[PDB]
């Protein structure tokens, strides 16, 4: 009736606090963002650490790992940039999203991988992709370095201040977005997923 | 068919209506914390996600009001700690009652319960609550006088997980029944499950 389990993150492994975090924190809603290389290279890769900051001005965070202690792609790029687009991923192109995902060399663009098409942004010089019903043109506020050891960060915490909104025509409505319309995909654990569930009001 | 909107021109409340209802579904943590006299407060943020697992890291941004730090952020400042509970459909209720703007525990009928590592107590109706450090209070947005949130970074410290969700290091999902944020008044159950 109220059996309660005491777990200590420092007697399990990396995998095991992770899996307890990404099963606990869920439904996660998960961004999928655009950034360009120094190269010129279209980037980009859904991350399911994202949320809202503050609505003055609109800022966002993204928290993107490092991979042993190195910052990936979509970090260097918004960083060298100062500029990326995020995209509210939805059912119309989480087949395309997932596509992204998966590990290309450095410089290779997931977007035309996954048969998406790239549409320039109007503020910033990264393009986002045309087949998202919202997407969000960013400048970075800040890049935050966190976790892992004092030489080897975990991951960066990207703060992007929203400079253009582009929205669904469909969508909106007084100001507001019609959830059910945008059919917003969440992040669970494991490679689950879930649709956006029934609505109720307090 | 895409309209192109500017935040600059439009109102703070604007740009808040159109990323509430955009960034969704949002978890929600709610969050208790204690003052400097002992007095336990409660309430719930949607502004919530993971930030690494290595060590287990998590965020909450908390908004201020008129530039002041909400009761949240200046208690988990000066005790240096906080309890962040899952909230879910059996007490959703409950959470709400704590919005409200004394201790929001005692009004809303929740029960505290001592941590095992932190000073914060939490509640016992959570089914899943992490006891946290705080990293750090990043204040964010606003004006350098009145920033606009402050962005907790917490680490956890030792997880409390009820046993019937809890499988060999996962989380049932189905048997959780977390309940997530989205815009105005609306909140969200559990949606239907799909693997990618
Ligand atoms: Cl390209
Ligand atoms: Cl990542
Ligand atoms: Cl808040
Ligand atoms: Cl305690």
Do not use: W
Not at 11 to 36: C, H, M, W
Not at 137 to 149: D, F, N, Q, Y
């Amino acid at each position: 009736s109220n059996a309660m389990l005491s777990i200590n993150p420092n007697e399990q492994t990396e995998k095991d606090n992770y899996k307890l975090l990404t099963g606990s924190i869920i439904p996660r809603p998960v961004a999928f963002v655009t950034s360009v290389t120094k190269e010129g290279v279209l980037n980009g890769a859904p991350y399911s650490y994202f949320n809202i900051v503050a609505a003055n001005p609109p800022l966002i965070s993204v928290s993107v790992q490092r991979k042993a202690g190195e910052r990936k792609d979509t970090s260097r790029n918004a960083i060298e940039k100062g500029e990326f687009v995020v995209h509210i991923s939805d059912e119309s192109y989480v087949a395309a999203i997932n596509e992204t995902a998966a590990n290309l060399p450095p410089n290779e663009s997931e977007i035309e991988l996954a048969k998406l098409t790239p549409i320039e942004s109007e503020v910033i010089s990264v393009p986002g992709v045309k087949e998202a019903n919202i997407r969000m043109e960013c400048v970075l506020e800040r890049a935050i370095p966190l976790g892992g050891t004092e030489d080897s960060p975990a991951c960066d915490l990207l703060i992007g201040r929203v400079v253009r909104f582009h929205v669904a025509e469909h969508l909106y409505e007084k100001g507001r977005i019609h959830a059910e319309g945008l059919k917003p995909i969440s992040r669970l654990a494991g490679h689950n997923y879930a649709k956006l569930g029934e609505q109720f009001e307090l």
